[PDB]
Design an enzyme around this catalytic site. Sequence first.
Site, PDB file in Angstrom:
ATOM      1  N   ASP A  78       0.657  -1.088  -0.091  1.00 11.15           N
ATOM      2  CA  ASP A  78       0.023  -0.019  -0.044  1.00 11.15           C
ATOM      3  C   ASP A  78       0.863   1.169  -0.146  1.00 11.15           C
ATOM      4  O   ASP A  78       1.737   1.330   0.960  1.00 11.15           O
ATOM      5  CB  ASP A  78      -0.916   0.031   1.133  1.00 11.15           C
ATOM      6  CG  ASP A  78      -1.864   1.216   1.399  1.00 11.15           C
ATOM      7  OD1 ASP A  78      -2.681   1.368   0.277  1.00 11.15           O
ATOM      8  OD2 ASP A  78      -1.655   1.953   2.211  1.00 11.15           O
ATOM      9  N   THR A 123      -2.304   7.105  -5.248  1.00 17.07           N
ATOM     10  CA  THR A 123      -1.116   7.927  -4.408  1.00 17.07           C
ATOM     11  C   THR A 123       0.296   7.308  -4.788  1.00 17.07           C
ATOM     12  O   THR A 123       1.201   8.360  -4.692  1.00 17.07           O
ATOM     13  CB  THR A 123      -1.682   7.330  -3.109  1.00 17.07           C
ATOM     14  OG1 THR A 123      -2.899   7.888  -2.610  1.00 17.07           O
ATOM     15  CG2 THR A 123      -0.558   8.004  -2.185  1.00 17.07           C
ATOM     16  N   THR A 124       0.218   6.250  -5.117  1.00 16.62           N
ATOM     17  CA  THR A 124       1.596   5.627  -5.666  1.00 16.62           C
ATOM     18  C   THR A 124       2.120   6.414  -7.000  1.00 16.62           C
ATOM     19  O   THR A 124       3.358   6.548  -7.110  1.00 16.62           O
ATOM     20  CB  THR A 124       1.961   4.298  -5.747  1.00 16.62           C
ATOM     21  OG1 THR A 124       1.614   3.709  -4.314  1.00 16.62           O
ATOM     22  CG2 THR A 124       3.228   3.538  -6.215  1.00 16.62           C
ATOM     23  N   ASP A 154     -10.406   2.193  -0.217  1.00 18.45           N
ATOM     24  CA  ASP A 154     -10.377   2.634  -1.566  1.00 18.45           C
ATOM     25  C   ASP A 154     -11.595   2.618  -2.404  1.00 18.45           C
ATOM     26  O   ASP A 154     -12.142   3.513  -3.172  1.00 18.45           O
ATOM     27  CB  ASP A 154      -9.384   1.780  -2.365  1.00 18.45           C
ATOM     28  CG  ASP A 154      -7.900   2.149  -1.859  1.00 18.45           C
ATOM     29  OD1 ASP A 154      -7.798   3.252  -1.276  1.00 18.45           O
ATOM     30  OD2 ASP A 154      -6.986   1.323  -2.171  1.00 18.45           O
TER      31      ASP A 154
END
Lengths: 520, 519
Positions: free
Chosen positions: A54, A87-88, A385
């Site tokens: 995550d 986000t990554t 999510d």
Amino acid sequence: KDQDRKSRLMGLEALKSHIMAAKAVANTMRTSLGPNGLDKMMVDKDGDVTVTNDGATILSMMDVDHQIAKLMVELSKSQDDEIGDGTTGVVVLAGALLEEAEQLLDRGIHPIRIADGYEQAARVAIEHLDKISDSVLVDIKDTEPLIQTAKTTLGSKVVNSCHRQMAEIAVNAVLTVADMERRDVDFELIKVEGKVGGRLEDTKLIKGVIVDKDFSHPQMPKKVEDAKIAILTCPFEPPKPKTKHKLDVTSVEDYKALQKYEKEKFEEMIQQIKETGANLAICQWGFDDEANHLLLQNNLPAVRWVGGPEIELIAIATGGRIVPRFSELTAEKLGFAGLVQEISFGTTKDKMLVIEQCKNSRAVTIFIRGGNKMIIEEAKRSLHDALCVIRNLIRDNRVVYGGGAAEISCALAVSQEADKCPTLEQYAMRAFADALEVIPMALSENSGMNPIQTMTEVRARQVKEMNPALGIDCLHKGTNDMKQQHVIETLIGKKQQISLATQMVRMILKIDDIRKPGES
Amino acid sequence: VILLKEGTDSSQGIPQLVSNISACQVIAEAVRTTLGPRGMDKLIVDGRGKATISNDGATILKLLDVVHPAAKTLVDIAKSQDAEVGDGTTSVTLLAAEFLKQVKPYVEEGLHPQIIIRAFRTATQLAVNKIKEIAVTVKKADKVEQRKLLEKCAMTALSSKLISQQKAFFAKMVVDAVMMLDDLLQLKMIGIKKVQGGALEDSQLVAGVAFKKTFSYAGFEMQPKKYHNPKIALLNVELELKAEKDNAEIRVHTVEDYQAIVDAEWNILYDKLEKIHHSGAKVVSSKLPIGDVATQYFADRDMFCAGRVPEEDLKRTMMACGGSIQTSVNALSADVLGRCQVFEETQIGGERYNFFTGCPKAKTCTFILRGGAEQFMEETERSLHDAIMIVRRAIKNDSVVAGGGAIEMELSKYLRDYSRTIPGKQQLLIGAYAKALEIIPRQLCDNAGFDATNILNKLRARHAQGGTWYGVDINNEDIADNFEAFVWEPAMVRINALTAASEAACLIVSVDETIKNPR
């Protein structure tokens, strides 16, 4: 003061040093991007060992004393309340913008002039997303496609087995606190909890306030049809404090006296229930075996050993009030709830308090079970999510096809608009087109395929083969065109993905100097 | 064995003056790239690890505090310029260090420092007289209301920004915020709040003090939001049921005693609740949160309660209503209570915001920012502080001169032609004073990413043709008239900039030796 040992650097050397520290974070999360991304091991300060891919957890656990690196962590904090998916991808995209900007610094382009080119090229990519987008739920309310789409993204996490069950829970929860007509969803009203034991399929959706507490007696009615809720900080019995008991006997005269208060206060506090008209009694400390007797014939439900902070949670959802003293009892402070039931899970007895309104309320909490704590904790962020995706699906029906098809299609539009910009910002628009190509390229590397060979073929298919955009296959499925694979991400998630990345690149390029005092 | 110094470090003559000139260039180098609205930012970390990002030169110099003796001279003059005005500390620092750099090669040639002081006193007096002649007073000119002229000057600093599309709406917001104030104008009066989410044009301006109102607790469907002359209560007290400030802990073996323990626990809180109701305070605000129990007593007694208000918003409100902030509830009385004309609770931002409209003592208002992210509001916020001062100074001082180095070029031409007419050593020094003024228009070109050589060569050649008001444009790269572009600055402020720069430059030259008493 403390001028000695003060860090002093400027010019192009300070900018390249800031880019190097930022690329260290981007190269770390570049391998964990996508469902095939490699996991990262985490050793907690207390000695625990956790392993998860995550992205929101990685930047939180990474502690870097470098100032520019701390700014990258502050970016993901605001994105978790907006996107929660890429986000990554933002950190990888932010590191790609600074990596291409290092090549432009050797040509003599001013950093502010570079920051202008990214902002000018960003508006072209945002406008291009709306043209290639598509809707789903437009002009209709249907829960069938909302379950299928959110189920695909959840398959990569630890919920893969129960993945079908988790999608249905998030649909009824968001529709409960928010209507699909207004398209305004409050994520704060949707809570999440968890407990060890059972499986992931034991997750139950309850509309209301819910905590794990049992009844004062096992034979109490399992379902409460009438709505009366008495919320107090004290049980019905001879009075007791709210903190500690510490029973110390003095003489026999005081012990025999307490027995006189027993029979006196047992009947007096129960008749106060029938006098006021309450049914379900909520109190901080539980009931003894004597108080449960009189509650059996009158069919009066009660909850024993309620926690301190859990008292205020019930009064908010049920609308009741807290009654600290017995002289404040009254009917107007009684709560309201549709039905109060006791649902036991399996053979082991959890005996959880379930408070429902028998309708759609403004407060829902998802209670997740599971066999391992590391699986439940990962199941919490996975469902978080899906709560954000469905939130964006209701707020904006328009969506785009993921898997890299969006970032590649924008790279073609920006590259064509570069020749229409007669000025030094033209080079910044070209580097912005190549930086968007990193996200689809990183997905091909994590899947065990040639990053460049796969990327070049897809760009030719979106032009020569067919005009519509095509994606890259990470999971090694049948073929390309993720539209058939049903891989779709929200449109708002794409607009905020490249926007929050461009904002931080402009923020880093504008800082040419860092000053910190040294220890002398 | 026997020496005169014995730890005393002192140097005199030319090397002492040269060492001070090199030290003054370090101070100017830090604020060098922060000049101009588009100038780059800086990052200063304190000893505790707190990061600070600001482009203002006055704020940076306060966090530096250089221990060099000659460096403290320029810092003290910069602080004096920020207290009297609040802008131009960067202009004073650059001109002060540039004066020493031009005369640096002349000192090494044997020129006496006193002659250099004679030039800075004479050339400055000619610059003051030249500005007063060229200055133009524009007030009712072109038969335009001041509201429209202040609007075009507002969008000047707001042009070519992220808000440059909606800047037409934000231009009136700066004008409306200044006009609500009385004849006493100051920057810290008007407040600015940031609210994430929503369109840019949704930014609201409130004449009163507004706050985010984080208070979610009980008392809904009560506490009417419309009052006429309510008594504003300011208390730091915490009225929560369960809290560390008000509570009771007593343990005994007698069950009968616990009946009085739980009753006296609420009676102590009721005594503080009755004291507020006794003083007659209608609007009751508190910095610390207030529990649900105290809100029920206020709903039964018909009293308004809004908690979790920041202390800074309380002080801006304290000056607005004319009341006072009192920590203890026992000292609450009509002396500390404030008043207001109209109170209303709006839907703005999707979250309830309370504001006091029509306070007799209120000189302050509150402006709310609405954008897609924090970077949209933060970049806009820094532009709004400058936009308000542009509207503030244009009303105060009617005679103005153009910015962007336009006035710096005209003075360089007049002093260059006059220096040729004075035979003596004053000819080389006044000529160097003219080239020293070129640092202001040059730094604006480098910080904007332009080419300083092509602009200054084209700009200087244009002033030879007689154009007085032409200057550097920070948006488009070219020479342009800043007077027709409505880039204005007060004449008296720029005059004090040259006087403070020359006076600070003469102090460094006037010191030929540094005596340090060993301790």
